[PDB]
Each structure stands twice: as C-alpha cells, then as structure tokens.
C-alpha cells in the first residue's frame, strides 16, 4: 500500500499546488478546463483553466485562475487520460463534495 521510502535523491525540479474545492453534485464547483477540441481523445498536455465561475469554489481558492494548469485531478493525471475523463474526474469528485487539483509551476521569481 503506502510503503515509506528514504535515502537520497533530489528535490522536485518543479513545484505544485493542491486546490481543494467543495460543492454539491448539482451546483458542482465552478471551473472550466481547457484542452483539445475533441473529448474522445487522450491529452498530450495538461488542460488550463479555460474559465472560472464567479463567487465559485474554484474562484474562492484565488490561487486558481485562467491560464493555470491541471496536471492531475484527485491524483489522476490528465495527460494520462482524455479531456472528457478530466472533466468527468471533476464530476465524480463533485459527487464527493470535494476535489483535489494539481497545478504545475516553478515556485520562484515568476515575473509577468
């Protein structure tokens, strides 16, 4: 199951942030993913936050915003799935009243 590990290695070359969203299965959450046009097709890259709902849970996180990336969802890699799956993954999560998203970025002097 969860076997502990240790010894050496190196720090992650990239950083990430866990976005915990909560909502009902009806009202869902409040976030839109951005990726391939077609649904029935794997994702070579992580989908971006196409859009976000105002006063929504995804927005309440603040940290989240259009442009962000979604590596995995609840531990499910988006690149190892299809657009739909990603969206669907958000559905099942909604039914849980909780969801976890993983964003990618280089924690540092990100000027813009």
Q: What would you report as the CA-atom Rg of the chain, rounded to the nearest whole angstrom?
A: 15
Q: Which two tokens stand for residue 107?
A: 């924690």
What would the 3-class secondary structure string for 23-51 be? CCCCCCCCEEEECCCCCCCECCCCCEEEE
DSSP per-residue string spanning 58-88: HHHTSS--TT-B-SEETTEESTTSBHHHHHH
**Backbone phi, then psi, for 87, in 5-degree steps?**
-65, -45
Please identify which residue in the block is written with the tokens 């958000």.
90
Q: Is the dihedral of CA 31, 35, 39, 45 positive or negative?
A: negative
Inter-residue contact 105 to 17 (CB < 8 Å):
yes
Domain 14-106 -> CATH class: mainly beta
Per-residue CA distances from 45 to 36, 58, 79 (Å): 9, 21, 5
Distance (Å, rounded) from C-alpha 88 to C-alpha 85? 5
Q: Is the dihedral of CA 10, 16, 17, 20 positive or negative?
A: negative
Distance (Å, rounded) from C-alpha 36 to C-alpha 60? 26
**Backbone phi, then psi, for 100, in 5-degree steps?**
-135, 125
């Amino acid at each position: 199951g969860s076997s502990g590990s240790s010894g050496g290695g190196q720090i992650v070359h990239t950083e990430t942030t866990e976005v915990v969203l909560c909502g009902d299965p009806l009202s869902g959450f409040g976030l839109q993913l951005q990726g391939g046009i077609f649904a029935t097709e794997t994702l070579s890259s992580p989908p971006l936050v196409c859009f976000i709902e105002p006063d929504s849970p995804a927005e309440r996180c603040g940290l989240l915003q259009v442009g962000d990336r979604v590596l995995s969802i609840n531990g499910i890699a988006t690149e190892d799935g299809t657009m739909e799956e990603a969206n669907q993954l958000l559905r099942d999560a909604a039914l849980a009243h909780k969801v976890v998203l993983e964003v990618e970025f280089d924690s540092g002097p990100s000027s813009g």
